[PDB]
Amino acid sequence: GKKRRKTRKESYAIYVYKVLKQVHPDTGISSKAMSIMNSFVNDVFERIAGEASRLAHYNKRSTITSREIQTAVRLLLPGELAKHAVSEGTKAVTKYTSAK
Amino acid sequence: RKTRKESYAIYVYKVLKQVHPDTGISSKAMSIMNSFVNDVFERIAGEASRLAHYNKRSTITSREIQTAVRLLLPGELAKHAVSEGTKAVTKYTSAK
Amino acid sequence: PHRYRPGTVALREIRRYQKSTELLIRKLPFQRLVREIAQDFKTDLRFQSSAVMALQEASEAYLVALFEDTNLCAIHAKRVTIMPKDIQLARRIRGERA
Amino acid sequence: PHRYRPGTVALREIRRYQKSTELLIRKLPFQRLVREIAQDFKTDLRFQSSAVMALQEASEAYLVALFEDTNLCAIHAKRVTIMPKDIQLARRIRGERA
Amino acid sequence: DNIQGITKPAIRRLARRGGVKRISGLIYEETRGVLKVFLENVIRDAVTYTEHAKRKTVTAMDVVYALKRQGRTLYGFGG
Amino acid sequence: RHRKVLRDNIQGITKPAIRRLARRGGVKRISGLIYEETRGVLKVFLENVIRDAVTYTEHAKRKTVTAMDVVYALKRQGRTLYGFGG
Amino acid sequence: KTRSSRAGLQFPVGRVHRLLRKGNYAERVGAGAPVYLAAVLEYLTAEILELAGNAARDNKKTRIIPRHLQLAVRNDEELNKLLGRVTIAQGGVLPNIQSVLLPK
Amino acid sequence: KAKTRSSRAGLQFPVGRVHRLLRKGNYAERVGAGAPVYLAAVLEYLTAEILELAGNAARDNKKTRIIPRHLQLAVRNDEELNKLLGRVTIAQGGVLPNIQSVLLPKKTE
DNA sequence: ATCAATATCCACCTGCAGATACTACCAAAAGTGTATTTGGAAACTGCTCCATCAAATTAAATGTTCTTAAAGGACCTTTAAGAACATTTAATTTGATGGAGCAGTTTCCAAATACACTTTTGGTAGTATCTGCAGGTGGATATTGAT
């Protein structure tokens, strides 16, 4: 174990996988396909959080809330994706808030 | 009844007075210059923001600005701007 | 009785409009189109006059700019008449579509 | 001897090359080109193996994207043969040049 | 009506300003198409900003920011 | 230690190679005049990206260009590329 | 019990919160944000894997590859637009030849 | 007070302000004391160059007041400025006069 | 609507390169729970400016009629680019070696924030005085298309 410890490089890899097994339980994914898939999550993370960044700022808000993300999403994603994402986003925040 | 809408209107003017003291500017055209100034400020501070992030730095220094200016402005315009940038920082630290 | 060559007023109008900067669409109709369209996203919206004006200024940039590119397309087909296929081609290559 | 008509091997090469995803420029030549250019910004650079690969990918991806547009400009002028003016129009409309 | 409110001559004025000399008959409907698409895209974003800031008035900043993220930045209203 | 004079490697991009590209691009017929033209563009493209890539390398005071150097380059270039990090 | 589970998501609510703070997108970051964002990213992950999933199978293959991801994206209007200016390494292109080029 | 940070560097633009704008704009946790100085200068320079280029634009057109259309000319003539703002549209700035030469008097001239 | 040369198709098999699967360790993360602070929701209210009259006043669009030249189609000649093969150049592959330099770590202060207190001003309102040029004709010279 260890060569003076090389620091931790994280990626959404295990989650991308879990979700792959949720839709396609008999399907794989190469490292090259996983890497791509990993860039896709970061790309969209950034894109959204940057839109939400600007959105708060325009409104003189110092806080990015579920609503900043929500609007960011509807500005960023096209028709149907925006439709379903909003639907999932609201589903999750609801489940989380009244979960205690 | 007062909320400040701070713009670059006067600093544009002071500079207009230097390059061209016999010349004035319409508000239509001054506004364009206020838009220009902010736009560019954003682009550069944004680009500088990314730089420090890429290099896991928590501080934006004169250096980040510099590289950003090189990344953003075209060769010759980037050329002049760097010089004027280094002048300002040197003169400012040379000061009493 | 006077008659000019087909195309000479055109050139007069080009030089004329390229010299000038006034918005070439009549203010009102355009104002109705903005409302009509905006109505589909949220009903009973009020518009700052500046905000409708911003939108016209840009609509106008867009189309002129697009007519430049549309022009270079018709010219490319060894023609002097802009035609839909030119507009569709310029837009395909710009990224609006594809 | 059996001879194929002009533009059938061509079409066969289109299907062949759209169906696959390998890189079509040779590893080494391309790699030299990178190093040669990178020299004008820095003497004695070093290049991560994957940092080059990253460039070839975007390059070939880009050059294929451009040829598609080029092809639509050739076709626009009732040509099937791309020509330098097509590459230039396409880049002009893209706003890569003028 | 409405989209027809954008007059054949007005489209000509824009082709002229853009340096076009001779214009096909079909260009006008095609241009009417194009602009509506341009307006739908920008106004959708405009209104999103308008909605998000719980306003009932589409201000100019809204329009400005819509145009900025459409990649079609506009100066001279944005302050 | 060598570090050879690399000059006009642009000719290393062969007429046959440029063909295969146009082909995947879906181009049936290529003017002989294209090959030079295409060597033009590729050269402009690479210049643009490596200019930016290396600026990042300098900014991190590195002598090695990392794939992230090219990935960020290309991002701010307008040509986002997946699967090489970031 | 984790916040991810607490919101009923595979993606990491904990991590997504952290990254939001590390990026300085705003001075404060509410508790709602990382949840919605993980959600949306999970859904998007799911949409694209579904599609490529099927693309893998169409081509008689069980291990998804970048090619399958391209075919997924470029064949889907919305996904193709969102990734409008994105390049999938080793992805190739959709087989497409212009009509006027085919022999007649 | 004693000295404005602006004058200390021989800059008209508000160093002090720019520094503050950087903090509240959420660009990085920390902002160095020389950062805005550099930046202010760069903004001055760029403001100087266009005003100068458009100040000239008002000459060739007889006027002592810069209107929008001057700025347009100032930019779309400078190759390097045109590029920097190739994605910007200036309000009420019209175009540069240009006609493709295959559209002119008696055939392709 | 037949023939043959050639490519494209799938079935079947083998090797290895990458994919998966043990296991075992750990730092940074992500959790539960305290204590303090604070954004911005809400509820209000004051007035800026958005909408909408009808009604004179200006300016533009739509329809029509003769007209010319541009678009596109058919024919014909030039040639330049595809197909194919003999020849030769170059890339790639395997494999092993020397060294730069990236990135992991301990350290520690010029330089950052953090905080009160002092001074300054850039924005706003109000009031008024000023002026650069649009838009108005005047009448030489200039361009364009009939002779």
Place this chain on the structure above:
DNA sequence: ATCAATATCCACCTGCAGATACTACCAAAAGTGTATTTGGAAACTGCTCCATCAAATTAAATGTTCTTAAAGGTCCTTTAAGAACATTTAATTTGATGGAGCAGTTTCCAAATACACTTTTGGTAGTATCTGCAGGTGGATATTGAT
């Protein structure tokens, strides 16, 4: 080239919008000065992977011969779009006038942040065995071009 028909460029003039000038108020901003936390530059260096080199192997480039259907050009006809003027249709401009709602201002509390000790877990790492598919094969079927 002759010449009349408009179009343009030239000077000159002038009313008012829209800049600008002068007072004065002030909250918020820009500084200063003073105690106090910390980011990353210096240094050192483990050890990762990049430059390079040879030799064999294997793949692609090239330069050349033959040809034909693409481009490109001329000369034809068809009819679509400009120029123009006579109407009609619409847009602007004004003036007055409600009252939507954006923006200020003061609450107050749900929800943010803090710094603290507590528990989990995703990644690194090492060691080891699988498995999905390229890639090569053959034999059977579809395609193409000459009939």
